[PDB]
């Protein structure tokens, strides 16, 4: 039969509970992301002060860096050489950093950016990178760019700390609805409509039907990036968890 | 019956509820602290790699360091000289880092430590410092210690993000009861018995005589230091909110 009698009050408590999850995780996410950008910028400044390869290796090979990012690499405009923090890393024999998304985004913007999701050269896996240009301290000339890789699997884990008891999940999308981080990596870098049905962001908690079932969906902006933290919650389970 | 039992329940809930607040904050807090410790270790490793004063200044004068810590200074064992990140800082005409607690604590521990509260030489204010020793990379000899100053006021501000709807406040203490951080800086460095009445730490929630009056008080350990986060809330106002 149908879902039966449902308190117009309890389903506003759910509506607000959802708003609260997204708003809070979005603050949390902005802080963690800001933290990692700050570490990237510091390393980059140290490198600019003296970009000798041995100095670069020292700066990027410390535990803090190796623990904060998947991989770090500084590509040179001059010859497409690179200095990186993982001797096991092989992006391929003819790889030129100068053509890559992290490199071009940092060059094009002349400042620190985080890339849209893109396919890793070595593994093909989708990730993002913090990326920064490196300028000649004397002349201001562009010398190359540095990437700092960020695991989307790990971002997904981070935003799903919140305890939802299989009632729903948290994810991250960009302003245009491209998925930044989903519990199912298969969606990373794809339109959020692939799992939500809807393609456009509507921040206010609202009902969405997915395979015939009602879900409460809400979003909240992330300060510092054109990103939103989103949540999708089985409305029936949510209502039921509460009712009781 | 309906009164005794109901009251016992609300009191058991108000207990738990309060234990919860500080269990959370003791996790948030360790997160922040471990973050600041990792930055200090990072900068120290880079300094040990090349402790020439110009390189030291470059490392400790970047915005990440300037925004993470109140002040940073490397005190030298050879002559008591120092390299610091604020040319306007002046600890006085007869200051020697080698008799200061941050310096000795790091020299003795032979690794990274945080100090107990102490009085800042320049300003008199009560603070703590992350402190690290510096070794000559060629001979292993002790070269000096570095301090990275932590604002206790700002720490109080942090633990008090928590919305207590003005019914109480959060604070930090060390094992022996010494106040690490209190919303009123006058208590920093003092026995907690001064604002609680209680001189000894009891983690599980409980009632406390202060102005011959009842507030709820719980402690949760902080992972990584011999510290505890603590809370005090109005039991009357507490009870009322869990009751309704």
Author numbering:
A (entry chain A), B (entry chain B): 53 to 296
Q: Which passages does the manuscript contain on this structure?
A:
Extracellular signals are sensed by methyl-accepting chemotaxis proteins (MCPs), also known as chemoreceptors. Indeed, we found that Mlp37, the closest homolog of Mlp24, serves as a chemoreceptor for taurine as well as serine, arginine and other amino acids. We determined the crystal structures of the ligand-binding domain of Mlp37 in complex with l-serine and taurine to reveal the molecular mechanism enabling Mlp37 to accommodate these structurally distinct ligands, l-serine and taurine. The ligand complex structures and the mutational analyses demonstrate that only one of the two potential ligand-binding pockets (the membrane-distal pocket I) is involved in ligand binding by Mlp37.
The titration curves of purified Mlp37p (10 μM) with taurine show direct binding with a dissociation constant (Kd) of 3.2 μM, calculated by assuming that an Mlp37p monomer binds one taurine molecule. The taurine complex, like the l-alanine complex, forms a dimer with a neighbouring molecule in the asymmetric unit. Taurine and l-serine are bound only in pocket I in the crystal structures. The binding of taurine is remarkably similar to that of l-serine. The amino group of taurine lies at the equivalent position of that of l-serine and interacts with Tyr-170, Asp-201 and Asp-172. Two oxygen atoms of the sulfonate group are located in the corresponding positions to the carboxyl oxygen atoms of l-serine, but they are out from the plane formed by the guanidino group of Arg-152. Thus, the indole NH of Trp-147 seems to contribute to the interaction in conjunction with the guanidino group of Arg-152, the indole NH of Trp-154 and the main-chain amino group of Ser-173. The remaining oxygen of the sulfonate is located near the hydroxyl oxygen of l-serine, and it interacts with the indole NH of Trp-147 and a water molecule bound to Asp-172, the indole NH of Trp-141, and the main-chain amino group of Ala-174. These structural features are essentially the same in the two subunits of the dimeric Mlp37p taurine complex. The residues in contact with taurine can be superimposed onto the corresponding residues of the l-serine complex, with root mean square deviations of about 0.3 Å (0.314 for A-subunit and 0.265 for B-subunit), indicating that taurine mimics l-serine in Mlp37.
